[PDB]
């Protein structure tokens, strides 16, 4: 029942807590002597919020290029719409009989269905966001493979002018993503991996400076420079691939 991110948690955790509070008072098929007041107007507001959520969702499916969104968002629309129909029915049943036991069951089932379908849409949305972050990580991995072909100081200046701000963007993205995660062990892994990558960048540029300046020399320390460059690229690449793996981790809850 734990939520994947702090954004999802703030939206859904209060709804889950309130359903569990209602369940205390009403087990399936349980009778009580408390008249439920007319729920027509609060349910109509849920109905308006549902149709609006489905409208936004459908606009994404119609315009997106993400095949996973096109596949996973439409079943969640059906979930939320079916669940909303149970709440409309519960309100109609309670209007004629405020003690209606089947209406109390429809309230719990309807509410659970809204929460479950909203959870599905939000997790699907979050998974698409993670794919965008991974694309940025892979872009850095690809340009790191270009380091081996840099052979002049002019080309090194060009290389650092693209890689420097590019790395700053990746660092900012991982920082915001780790902050949103609810699993502490996953946050630590991302922070440490991203810190190792940040520290290795000036190490890489230093090795490239020595490589380029000792390239065509007999007594030269090119060998040590080329070795330090390839080793730094390998270590940076393994840590970014660790970030990509951590970014896709899911815990046993639930």
């Amino acid at each position: 029942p734990v939520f994947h991110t702090r954004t999802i948690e703030s939206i859904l955790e209060p709804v889950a807590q309130q359903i569990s509070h209602l369940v205390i008072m009403h087990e399936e098929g349980e009778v009580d002597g408390k008249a439920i007041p007319d729920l027509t107007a609060p349910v109509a507001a849920v109905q308006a919020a549902v149709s609006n959520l489905v409208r936004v969702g459908k606009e994404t499916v119609q315009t997106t290029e993400d095949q996973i969104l096109k596949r996973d968002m439409p079943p969640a629309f059906i979930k939320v719409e079916n669940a909303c129909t149970k709440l409309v029915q519960a309100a109609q049943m309670l209007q004629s009989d405020p003690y209606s036991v089947p209406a109390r069951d429809y309230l719990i089932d309807g509410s659970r269905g809204i929460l479950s379908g909203t959870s599905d849409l939000l997790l699907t949305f979050d998974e698409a966001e993670v794919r965008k972050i991974i694309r940025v990580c892979k872009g850095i991995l690809e340009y790191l493979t270009v380091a081996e072909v840099v052979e002049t100081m002019e080309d090194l200046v060009t290389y650092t002018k693209n890689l420097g701000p590019g790395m700053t963007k990746m660092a900012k993205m991982i920082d915001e993503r780790q902050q949103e995660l609810t699993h502490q062990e996953h946050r630590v892994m991302l922070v440490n991996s991203m810190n190792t990558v940040k520290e290795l960048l000036p190490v890489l540029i230093s090795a490239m400076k020595i490589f380029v300046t000792t390239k065509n020399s007999k007594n030269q320390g090119i060998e040590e420079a080329l070795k330090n460059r390839n080793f730094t690229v390998e270590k940076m690449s393994a840590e970014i691939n660790e970030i990509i793996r951590v970014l896709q981790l899911t815990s046993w809850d639930e």
């Binding site: 939206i11 309130q18 919020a49 309230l107 909203t118």
Partner: peptide, 27 residues
């Protein structure tokens, strides 16, 4: 189409669900 995103629509839905459940709770 940038007017209201999915997060904003899910938030408005959470709010309407919270209102409904608290409305039932008040009796």
């Amino acid at each position: 189409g940038s007017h209201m995103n999915l997060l904003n629509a899910a938030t408005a839905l959470s709010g309407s669900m919270q209102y409904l459940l608290n409305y039932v709770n008040a009796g």
